[PDB]
Design a protein around this nucleic acid. Sequence first.
DNA 1: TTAGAGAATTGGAGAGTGTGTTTTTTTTTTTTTTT
DNA 2: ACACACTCTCCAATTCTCTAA
Lengths: 347, 81, 656, 51, 613, 92
Amino acid sequence: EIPELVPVGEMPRNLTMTCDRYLTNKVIPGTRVTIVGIYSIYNSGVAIRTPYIKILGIQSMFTEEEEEEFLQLSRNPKLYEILTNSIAPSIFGNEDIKKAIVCLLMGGSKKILPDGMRLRGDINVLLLAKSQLLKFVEKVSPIAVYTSGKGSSAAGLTASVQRREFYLEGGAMVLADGGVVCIDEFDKMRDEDRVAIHEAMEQQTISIAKAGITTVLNSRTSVLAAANTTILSRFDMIFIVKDDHNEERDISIANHVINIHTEISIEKMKRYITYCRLKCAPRLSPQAAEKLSSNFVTIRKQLLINPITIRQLEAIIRITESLAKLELSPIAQERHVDEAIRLFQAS
Amino acid sequence: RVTLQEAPGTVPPGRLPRHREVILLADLVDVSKPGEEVEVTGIYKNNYDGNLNAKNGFPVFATIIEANSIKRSWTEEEERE
Amino acid sequence: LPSIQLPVDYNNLFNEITDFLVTFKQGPKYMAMLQKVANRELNSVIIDLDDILQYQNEKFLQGTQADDLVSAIQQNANHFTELFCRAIDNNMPLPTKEIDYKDDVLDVILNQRRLRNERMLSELFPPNLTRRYFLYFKPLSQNCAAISSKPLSVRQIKGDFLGQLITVRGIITRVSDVKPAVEVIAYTCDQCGYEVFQEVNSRTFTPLSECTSEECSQNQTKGQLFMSTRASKFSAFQECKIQELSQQVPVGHIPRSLNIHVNGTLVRSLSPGDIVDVTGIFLPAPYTGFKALKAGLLTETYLEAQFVRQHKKKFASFSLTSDVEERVMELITSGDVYNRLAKSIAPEIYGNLDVKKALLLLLVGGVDKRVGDGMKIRGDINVCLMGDPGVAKSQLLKAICKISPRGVYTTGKGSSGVGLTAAVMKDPVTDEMILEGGALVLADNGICCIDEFDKMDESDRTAIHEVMEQQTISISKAGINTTLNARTSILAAANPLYGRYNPRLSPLDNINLPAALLSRFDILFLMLDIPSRDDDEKLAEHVTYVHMHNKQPDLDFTPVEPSKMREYIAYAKTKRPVMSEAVNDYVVQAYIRLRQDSKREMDSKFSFGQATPRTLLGIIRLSQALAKLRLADMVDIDDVEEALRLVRVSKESLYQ
Amino acid sequence: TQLGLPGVKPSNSGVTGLRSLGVRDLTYKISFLACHVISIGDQEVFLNSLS
Amino acid sequence: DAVFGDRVRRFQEFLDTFTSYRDSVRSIQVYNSNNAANNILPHRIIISLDDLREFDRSFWSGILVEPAYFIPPAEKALTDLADSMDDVPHPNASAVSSRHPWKLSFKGSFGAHALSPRTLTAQHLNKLVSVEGIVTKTSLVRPKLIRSVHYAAKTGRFHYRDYTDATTTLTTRIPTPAIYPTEDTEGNKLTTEYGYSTFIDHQRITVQEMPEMAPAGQLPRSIDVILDDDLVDKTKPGDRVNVVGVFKSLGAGGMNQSNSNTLIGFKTLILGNTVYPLHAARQMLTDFDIRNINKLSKKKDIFDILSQSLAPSIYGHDHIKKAILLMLMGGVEKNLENGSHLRGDINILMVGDPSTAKSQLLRFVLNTASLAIATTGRGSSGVGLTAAVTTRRLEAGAMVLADRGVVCIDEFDKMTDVDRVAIHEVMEQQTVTIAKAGIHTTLNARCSVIAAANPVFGQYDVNRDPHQNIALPDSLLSRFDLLFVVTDDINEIRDRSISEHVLRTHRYLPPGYLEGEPVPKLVTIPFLRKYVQYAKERVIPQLTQEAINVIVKNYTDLRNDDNTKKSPITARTLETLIRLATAHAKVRLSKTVNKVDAKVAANLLRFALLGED
Amino acid sequence: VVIEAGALMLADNGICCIDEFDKMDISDQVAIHEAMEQQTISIAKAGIHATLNARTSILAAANPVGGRYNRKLSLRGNLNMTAPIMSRFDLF
DNA sequence: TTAGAGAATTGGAGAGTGTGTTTTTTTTTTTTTTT
DNA sequence: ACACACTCTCCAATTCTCTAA
Ligand SMILES: Nc1ncnc2c1ncn2[C@@H]1O[C@H](COP(=O)(O)OP(=O)(O)NP(=O)(O)O)[C@@H](O)[C@H]1O
Ligand SMILES: Nc1ncnc2c1ncn2[C@@H]1O[C@H](COP(=O)(O)OP(=O)(O)NP(=O)(O)O)[C@@H](O)[C@H]1O
Ligand SMILES: [Mg+2]
Ligand SMILES: [Mg+2]
Ligand SMILES: [Zn+2]
């Protein structure tokens, strides 16, 4: 029965029913429906029988004109500024945070080589006010999962084995496979997850061999996280949130709160992100290769005379590809490399 | 059908509560909810049961109550007050 | 309804059988057995198929054709138990000796019934009622060989084999206790005073309740029948289960098993834990009554046991036939059996001679003792190996695991103290509690090998304390309060603390065992890995030769094979040599010196703890083992000095 | 149960041969058929109770 | 009734026309007849359905839409063909009346009838269908009676009768009561002749749709399959499988009087006709592969070519690649006559700084070995990694599952001490033994171990002892054949070379894609796998005196000379030398180990152990 | 459930004696605490619900931790008993 | 007074018909993952 | 289909009665 019709303090009542031929396989669990059917009884106290119903009726990708708008946006000379401005507009300042979130949403390009090695595409960011941005990322993203550090069950973030025969269940890294996942307090991570997130992030897999269980789980996702150590090495970019205390801002927020108590929109931006993810996967030009290699050896020499490592060069490449992805340019260029290393200053 | 149990206040000290079962017919169904304290009027009735006779080994009949009735705003003066 | 032709006529095979029983010889062989049966001296007849093959070959060489009876009784084995029995009944000779015939109830009953028929006149009863014997087939020798000679694992027994005679290899899982089963039932009619019989084959039957005898009927005497045990025929029955070896299970599968039935004198041959070659007849088990009508065509199946071959002869099965006498005389005449037998243990491992000699003395063991007031003293010997990583400890241990007829191998990490000793499991669905013994019970009267002894948890090692000295287990848990027997000797291996032995500390620091447990080993051997350019070269040459040729390098020495070694050791474990006063004085004087030297040097770096009274009986046990190996009936002082040397050498590794 | 109880099917050895049993078997249990019970474990009512 | 004969005639015409099936019948028959005089092949044949389409469309559609009326006569015609061909005389009693005809199987171009368990629908009942999925359950094998033979005692006549059940025949017949007759029509008492009677095997399984196709987290759906005779036990749970058979219904469906008011439906099954696996490892060589493998082996430096063809996307670390190749080849396992066992498989460990391609290189072995299991060190327990108890039943761990394969352990340093000590048996004795409540058993685990770890201080400290940097006991490090230390030393030209290399790697595009679309000589990996398979199966090099002369000298010099060597040297080092020499000889496809192989093995061990060449 | 009465039910309007209280498991001490708080017992399982009266006074004995009392310490330090249960005894 | 010919009453032999059957704790020993 | 419980039917065994030697 409908939830808004139940009397207070009672659990809802239900019925069982039958259908055949073309009425089969027409609905799925959780959908609200209207039904026409004969009400009758069947055998299964004294002189007493069970009721049921025999059903006789039930009631319950882009176009060209869409992608034209997305193409018009693609050739705007200030699109990067427009997308950064559209992200959490109420939050004051924090420019580079918004830029990093754009790069996280867009992502790099996946690649597979002749010898079978597989190259990652995802992006990972950490943030050290901060509560709002994760909710916004949840809303804008095509697929999103939100959780706090302790997790929804004993699976925690990654996974665990539980007990009577043993079984296994996955946390909020397996469930977010193929999409984005945001963690509200990364410091409240449990002990097992502290070690398991290494494999979850580097390999995009979780593997367990316990109590006769022997399986491997997929963890293909981009992680956003916030807190307030060596665990910072797993992330591509780390930043610290900043605040400003203009009274007009608080007064405006309060006035809006009283109003409810008494630039690109979200849906359009989400569809545009989906379109860009589906249509393009750019490649580095040779000039970018020379630029990046020279910068890499330059920084390592500067540190030597006074660390950078290959695992961070391969992150700078992904950021460069994600920046080139917005323009739908099939090749990345020095323009994107410059902004990539400029935005690389986490520190 | 409804199962009825002695109220805890009525039970003497050091004794377990007793139980009986009540049959509700056309107009009286869903008149009461579990956990309510209820007052019942009806006929006290009995019938043969094979399992009771088999287990106890004596010609022992089972008993049921058939309910006839079941029991458990403001004026303008209250509003003015 | 329909019918077919087949190539076999049973009349010819029956004629062949009755000729074979009266003609064959290696007088004729089987007529002696049937004479013993007639004299009531013998209860069972075992038919060899090797005799039938030899008979066929001899008849062929005489220039005559003959049916291949061997394959005929292998193909359809069930029918021929009846043919042989009928042939034996026909040809049975008369007794040679007086019997006291009146002891038999059936004789009196049948004689009186015959007299009743004789008076009345002025088949009677089923022939199974008077067969005083059992009959079994023994399969073909493989070295003469056919499928019955070639063992099958339990997976290879397909549905094609139903009805045939086969051989199976595996481990027994459980055994039932004996109970009787009816073959012929006897009744008595009250009014007319007449007896009738009924034969039972199926798992169930309906007893008779009306006297249908013609004389009883024609007198219109509707009498009542009553059952009688005193003239019924029973036969002993037992049921077991066999299961495939764990090392033959394919990957990812669960092991399978078969049900075995045993009747007659073959009963209580099998025991749990045995590795065995069973051979028998593989048959189905039909349903009965209303169950059959709605059970479908899927048939249950089992194996009728006929003959059993064990892989290793237990030491208790020994008897000195002249065949074994001739072989032990070889070793006795050759001489110096101690060194040869010690050298023969694991020839592929270089050096380590003293360790091998100690482990031989472990294999032999001391003499059990039981004082007149009821005290008893341990006979078994316990040994421990302590040494650096990579000096063939696990290898030598697992090598000794082969020689012993009863033995088990276990590692420290994979073992629970409960499962190592005995467990009280709530196993059945009926919530019943049942006791099932652990590894040390399965190794009863054998050796138990415990590798990685240092990794086992400190709490679980305490379970071994009772079994080591008292050779028994005591349990008092939910619904169970009993004592079990565990007459087992323990051999163990371990690394010192921190792995490789540390010379900075004393031996007791490196050993890291409590005093109560360190005392319970009769010998603890300390072996260290110290480089040397001379010795390493020799070891490397030996190992490289072994890898090249699969044979130990040899110029002078020939090891005795394991079978003859087992025969010599089994013969040596029967002697019980006694001590003498001259030896007693010597050992008594040695013990004082040992304890004084222990008291002097408890502070010293060369300490190994304090000598308890259990060190005296260790000397006596080792001396008696040495006396056993030379087949003496008297301990000699020569044995005592060797026992003392073998204890002294264990500590010399400390001095580089 | 082993007797002809209406509406119920049949369920150390017993006795047999009786008419109602047919081929069935009958056993028994021991119990006690009592006739009275006595336990051995307002101030005015209490005072009236006393001697 | 008359239509049965004509269909037999038409299929006889088909069998005469397409002659490649006559050769199959004759080859199976002559093979079985040969070894019988001393395994036996089944009496089964697979026909291409396309040939039957091109021969006669009416028979093709009859088979494919009305199998119950067309499959039996064709099978009868095949039995007639095989029976008319010459056969061994004087058959035995059991052979005379076996009741064992030949049987058919199909391949190719099912069209619309290729299905999955989700989409199998009531419209498809009594059609011949093909389904795909994962095996989830398997029943025990049981025998089944179909015929019994009896001997009449008085008359000397052999009698027989037949039995049927709903799952035994495509067509439908009156069921049989499974009773053995005891007495003749003429009153003679009968006896049952086991061994002349015929029984067949029977097994039921269950097949479920693959999890990759499950919609919306909905419950998955599955079908039961019936197998018999030859098809039994050819599958186990977890197998991906494709099954061919007739989809049929059973039973009374409650119309025989029941309390359900007939709301419950009829039961259904698939009668297994043919089973094929799915690859989701093994390959079979053609003649050209043998020619190429033999020709390539005579190059001067095959070892360099093959080693450098392993993981070309990873720059540097030549010696580790060569060690991995020798691991994949392996030594020779020995079993002496007295039952003693000598180890053959090689174990490798590598420890080093962060970011130095340890996990990336370890990942490569998982995708070129024929059988490989991967695990992380902290995500596995000792019992889970070896074996565990359940209900008593004992359940295998990871090292037991990969029996004759390789096991990869990442983050080895995070494994607890309690978990590590379970592994000391498996790496030398190659067995797992359990002694717990109600169980005592031994299991086989013959695999090779390769693993990676981090040093104690986070980066390797040359200014402290190797034991201080590597916190593992000496007894464990002894069991690894080769121990490699690797570090990220900062240098200009090294950094430039590596950075240019990875940048060249990231500019790859696959063949069939335009730019921007979403997705010396080196032998290809699909050829290298064939090379490794052939070399491991077909050549078993034996040792020689000239190799032994090198091995003994190298061992005795290496053990006794005082140096700052980074691993304990024991009797297991000699075995490592022998194994490496044998493996290098196996790379060469040599029937014997020579001096060159021992020299190369010594040079590799010296590099790994003493750190310099 | 078997429902059959426990010890506290038999001691209704009576004295219930607990000997060696300190050895009782915490999981049962909490049950005695819940009964003592209300003088009432509740059952709800397997479709059967019941409430019962437990007007019983408790007399308890316990051992100090370590077997001997410490005059340097409070009774809370000496006794292995949780504070809510200790708060509900009239006399120590 | 015996006995034999005819009629009436009762017993149970035995033939026939219908039927039924397979098939949430609570307490206690032990292994395993989790803090 | 295989033991049971219960019902139905026919036929001859038995005792009673009448008649005459
Ligand atoms: N004297 C020897 N003769 C032959 N092989 C030897 C000898 N000493 C050591 N080995 C070899 O050493 C290897 C390891 O033997 P093993 O029994 O496992 O040693 P271990 O002491 O038990 N190792 P560990 O368990 O770590 O203490 C085997 O391959 C043996 O062949
Ligand atoms: N030639 C190379 N040398 C080093 N790293 C490389 C090389 N080529 C690629 N990489 C990249 O280096 C990164 C680190 O590889 P990885 O195998 O995780 O190192 P690691 O030894 O496992 N570090 P860790 O997980 O902390 O132990 C990956 O992103 C590789 O793609
Ligand atoms: Mg060892
Ligand atoms: Mg890594
Ligand atoms: Zn009689």
